[PDB]
Design a protein around this nucleic acid. Structure first.
Ligand SMILES: [Mg+2]
Ligand SMILES: [Zn+2]
Lengths: 417, 515, 139
RNA sequence: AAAUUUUACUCACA
RNA sequence: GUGAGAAAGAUUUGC
């Protein structure tokens, strides 16, 4: 019981009658309406329902028996209570906003404010930093992009073949030949066979990054949609060769070898080795029963495979082609070649963007958008935005970055802005 | 291909980067950057501007919205097993429930009122005191933010204690209110394109436009700046407590706790930092770490740079630039007259996730593009047809479907390739209503939602209390017997009506079918 | 021992908000592990079978849109359309007819939708989702 | 073995 | 395949 709610209860019931004439709710703060000779379990009593009603604020319960009906006066101009009638009657009656002293406010000062402020004062504080010097210059020209591309080329070089990009081109093998070649390649590598599926067992890790170079661009990527769909399917269900209309791939779970109790079934964190076939003529050739094909492997974690396989090649290509300029022919190294170049290699580049889970091409595209929209940029700092080699790691991401830079160079050379 | 676009293009047609890399490296790098900024050798973290312009809201009632306090997203809960601190990764709902159980409070509002009205830090609130709450609220867990376009190396996000979330909710609500009062651009009901149009309207007078982004935004917003802003807007002891918790915060990397006295841990107080900038001047239109300003002469540019330095908004020399005929804000690019810049822009592709979710999201994206004028309607029709063909090629197999009904989509064993215009006009079979962007949820969405509800972090044996009477407030206190009675009555009514489960209600369909 | 005394140990009453949040199965998140989840246990196949035979023959037939007006390309603007929520009596009736209470409560709140539109008509009228280029009007 | 501290855990039950 | 326990299990990963 408190005296702060006297006014609140008075306006709650003004002329509300329950049976014919008698006020339904009697305020306990007024002796005229209060019932003498009986205990008071609340600030209001409903004769019709024969129950007590107690008003309290948000988060400030009062000491009343559980049987008493509690009404909550929310701070956002709304009310909550047990009975529907009380909730509705309170809402209409309290349509006028009246402040009841005893409501905590955001600016409330607690008794420990001084102690906490002193503790904050005794804690470390930052030191003012140096004022930067900013010089605005014109955005980089074709020479800077060429320099970046040449730096990448010199630092990393090129592979002798497009390892997994070559899987975008149909090999000269049929379904049965492809399955036999993949199975025999798995057998040759000493992969464990269990429950009709292949598993790659590892014991020790060199714990050093794999060699990184730049993949040359195949002539075209006709089997891009099929390759992505097959990657998705295989990484969803692994161990057996999965076939498409014109190609097939094998997803092998990679598991630790622990002896007898070694893992038998893959979990959600198990990586996969995706093995694909391409035309012969590289160091990764493999022969069996007169069937020759280049076998190329990509090691993907489950998230990487899910990202790669869910991309839409056809829709992306069409959306890009909606408002695209003429694409110049390019060579194996991404250099402009109007004599022996091919315009289909651009599709390959797109496939590369789909195969790269780091999607550095998106960073390059954003920086190139800034470049195109910019009139002046910071000196010796906007250029550094094109040097993303330290951000990524691996053959596929490196090739994607290199060919994104090559695309920027080609755009600046063929369609200068 | 993005490089050979006539208009503007961010290369958003593909999904963002992802990987299973552990978050140790990113969190360690962020903490090291924060420490370096603290030493005052790399960037500026000391606020110098005057915030007296900001109005004071110290007399406003302390209001908490429980909707954002309970959520299925992750959070860190701190317990003391024997004598050491153990940080467990739970859901925000579970963390809030545990906090209320230990403190023995019905609702978060009661907890905050009790915390603000204790005689001493050592006073007990249930099984814990304010001192214990502040000690536990300074612990954070680290995770990786993947699928962020343009960031090949994923950034580190942080999961906080339920008490930290409880205080941050109030602080950010009041900061957002003050921001809305400061300018008309920060209105709650405003889209990115509306904000960009207002920005264009604001900088038409001047000649040059500086489109700027802030570098190390989270590592340069010290607890001192947050406390300064909170005191300027009148947050009382809540702001002091939050600043104290932020100053002593510890991050659990792998299996070791690292102290990070600097920074604010990856966008916990976006509105507060926006206020830290907006209260010192009116020449900027900033949203956290992204802003646009305008100027006429190099002197104005120097003044802008000084203002940015004073407000601890360190300019990003790598990304910020100057234009005369362009305006980039909130990722949206507009011409100086306010019209949308021609080109793809921020159009994002729809990955293959569910036979029908893909179609619904593609319909939403194409509707957005067509309405904005990004592409003509026939192009959207062709793209929708192509997407339907691709979905058929990807999902039309026994694994996902075993039906052959004609009205079904070609990707579910059917033979119907709906026209985009036909779908948008509701001129199709009812089965296609779920594919409409404004239509019901698809089968895949419901299946995935149920499966998620069955996950380890979210699984519970509690008797579900769903399908409630609209007239019952969600703040009403209930017990086990009460929920049992409600469920029994509802099930009895449903069985009387002959329905085993409630019938799904769609606002659009109901409003359309009405006379 | 009941789950109520374990999940809410030390408390005899909790708000409906907390109890509802503890049992939530209607929030969808677009994630990478979607196709795998749908394939697992043929959950999507079973759900499609269930929908085609139990839920599909309950959706009312929605009339198609007819009205449209001539439109011309214009400067980008923001179209604000105010969709009002259900009335109290309407919500009570819909609940009594067996409609899911959660959806009715969600529709109870009045809402406003802002969308960027680059087409205008002579009479400056609103357009339906994605049909501004064709001129379909809310009316 | 590879896009190299990642591709790893225990118990009970069926 | 289900449950529980490891700073922890796939709606993971926050504002
Ligand atoms: Mg910007
Ligand atoms: Zn090779």
């Amino acid at each position: 019981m408190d005296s702060r709610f006297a006014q609140l209860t008075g306006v709650f019931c003004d002329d509300f009658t329950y049976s014919e004439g008698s006020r339904r709710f009697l305020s306990s703060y007024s002796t005229v309406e209060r019932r003498p000779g009986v205990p008071v379990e609340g600030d209001c009593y409903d004769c019709l329902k024969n129950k007590w009603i107690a008003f309290e604020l948000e988060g400030q319960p009062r000491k009343f028996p559980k049987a008493t009906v509690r009404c909550i006066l929310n701070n956002d101009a709304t009310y909550v209570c047990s009975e529907q009638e009380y909730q509705q009657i309170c809402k209409v009656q309290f349509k006028d906003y009246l402040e009841i002293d005893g409501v905590v406010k955001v600016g409330h000062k607690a008794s420990y404010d001084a102690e906490l402020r002193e503790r904050l004062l005794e804690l470390p504080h930052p030191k003012s930093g140096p004022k930067p010097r900013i010089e605005w210059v014109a955005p980089p020209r074709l020479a800077d992009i060429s320099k970046e591309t040449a730096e990448l080329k010199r630092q990393y070089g090129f592979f002798e073949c497009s390892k997994f990009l070559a899987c975008g081109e149909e090999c000269g093998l049929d379904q049965e030949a492809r399955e036999l070649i993949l199975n025999e390649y798995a057998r040759d590598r000493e992969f464990e066979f269990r429950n009709g599926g292949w598993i790659q067992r590892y014991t020790v890790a060199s714990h050093k990054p794999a060699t990184q170079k730049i993949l040359p661009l195949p002539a075209s990527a006709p089997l891009a949609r099929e390759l992505l769909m097959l990657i998705a399917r295989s990484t969803t269900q692994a161990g057996k060769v999965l076939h498409s209309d014109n190609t097939s791939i094998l997803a092998v779970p990679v598991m630790r070898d622990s002896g007898k109790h070694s893992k038998r079934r893959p979990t959600a964190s198990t990586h996969h080795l995706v093995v694909g076939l391409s035309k012969p003529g590289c160091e990764h050739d493999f022969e069996f029963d007169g069937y020759r094909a280049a076998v190329h492997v990509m090691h993907l974690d489950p998230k990487q495979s899910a990202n790669i396989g869910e991309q839409d090649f056809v829709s992306t290509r069409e959306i890009y082609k909606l408002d695209m300029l003429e694409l110049p022919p390019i060579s194996r190294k991404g250099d402009l070649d109007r004599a022996s170049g091919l315009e289909t290699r651009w599709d390959v580049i797109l496939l590369l963007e789909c195969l790269d889970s780091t999607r550095v091409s998106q960073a390059v595209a954003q920086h190139f958008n800034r470049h195109r929209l910019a009139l002046s940029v910071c000196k010796d700092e906007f250029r550094k935005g094109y040097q993303l080699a330290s951000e990524i790691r691996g053959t596929i991401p490196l090739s994607s970055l290199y060919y994104s830079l090559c695309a920027v160079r080609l755009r600046m050379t063929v369609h200068p802005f | 291909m993005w490089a050979f676009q006539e208009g503007v293009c961010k290369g958003n047609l593909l999904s963002g980067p992802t990987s299973m890399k552990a978050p140790d490296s990113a969190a360690r790098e962020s903490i090291d950057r924060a420490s370096e900024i603290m030493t005052g050798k790399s960037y500026n973290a000391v606020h110098t501007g005057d915030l007296s312009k900001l109005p004071n809201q110290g007399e406003s009632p302390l209001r908490i919205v429980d909707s954002d306090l309970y959520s299925e997203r992750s959070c860190c809960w701190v317990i003391e097993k024997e004598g050491r601190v153990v940080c467990k990764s739970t859901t925000l709902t579970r963390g809030m429930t545990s906090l209320l159980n230990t403190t023995k409070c019905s609702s978060p509002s009661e907890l905050i009122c009790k915390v603000l009205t204790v005689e001493s830090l050592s006073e007990k609130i249930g099984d814990t005191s304010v001192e214990e709450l502040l000690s536990h609220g300074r612990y954070f867990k680290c995770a990786l933010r993947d699928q962020e376009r343009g960031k090949p190396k994923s950034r580190a996000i942080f999961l906080s204690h339920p008490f930290f979330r409880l205080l941050s909710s109030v602080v950010e609500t009041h900061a957002r209110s003050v921001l809305s009062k400061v300018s008309a651009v920060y209105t709650a009901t405003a889209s990115a394109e509306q904000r960009a149009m207002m920005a264009a309207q604001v900088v038409e007078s001047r000649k040059h436009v500086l489109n700027g982004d802030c570098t190390k935004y989270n590592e340069a917003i010290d607890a001192d700046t947050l406390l300064k802003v909170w005191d300027a807007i009148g947050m009382g002891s809540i702001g002091v407590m939050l600043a104290y918790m932020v100053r002593r915060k510890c991050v659990l990397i792998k299996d070791t706790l690292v102290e990070c006295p600097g920074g604010m841990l990856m966008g916990m107080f976006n509105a507060t930092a926006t206020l830290a900038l907006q209260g010192t001047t009116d020449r900027f239109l900033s949203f956290s770490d992204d802003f646009i300003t305008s100027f006429n002469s190099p002197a104005e540019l120097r003044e802008i740079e000084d203002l940015l330095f004073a407000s601890c908004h360190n300019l990003s020399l790598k990304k910020s630039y100057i234009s005369v005929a362009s305006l980039e804000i909130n990722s949206c690019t507009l011409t100086r007259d306010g019209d949308l810049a021609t080109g793809l822009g921020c159009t994002a592709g729809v990955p293959f996730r569910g036979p029908l979710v893909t179609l619904k999201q593609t319909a939403a994206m194409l509707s957005g593009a067509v309405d904005s004028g990004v592409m003509p309607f026939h192009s959207a029709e062709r793209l929708f047809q192509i997407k339907q063909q691709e979905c058929a090629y990807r999902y039309n197999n026994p694994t996902y479907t075993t039906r052959n009904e004609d009205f079904l989509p070609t990707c579910l064993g059917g033979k119907t390739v709906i026209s985009f215009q036909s779908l948008l006009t509701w001129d199709c079979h009812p089965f296609w209503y779920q594919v409409h962007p404004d239509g019901p949820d698809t089968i895949d969405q419901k299946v995935l939602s149920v499966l998620a509800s069955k996950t380890r972090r979210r699984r519970t044996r509690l008797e579900a209390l769903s399908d409630l009477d609209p007239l019952v407030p969600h703040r009403l206190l209930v017990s086990e017997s009460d929920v049992s009675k409600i469920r029994a009555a509802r099930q009895a009514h449903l069985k009387s009506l002959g329905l085993e489960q409630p019938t799904n209600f769609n606002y659009a369909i109901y409003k359309a079918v009405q006379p | 021992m009941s789950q109520f005394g374990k999940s809410f140990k030390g408390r005899t009453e909790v708000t409906i908000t907390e109890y509802r949040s503890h049992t939530v199965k209607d929030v969808h998140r677009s994630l990478l592990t979607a196709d795998k989840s749908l394939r697992k246990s043929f959950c999507f196949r079973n759900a499609l079978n269930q929908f085609l035979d139990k839920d599909l023959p309950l959706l009312p037939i929605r009339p198609k849109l007819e009205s449209r007006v001539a439109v011309k390309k214009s400067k980008l603007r923001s179209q604000l359309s105010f969709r009002p929520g259900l009335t109290q009596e309407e919500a009570i009736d819909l609940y009594n007819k067996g409609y899911d209470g959660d959806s009715v409560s969600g529709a109870l709140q009045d809402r406003v939708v802002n969308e960027p539109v680059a087409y205008s008509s002579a009479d400056n009228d609103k357009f339906h989702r994605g049909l501004a280029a064709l001129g379909y009007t809310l009316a």
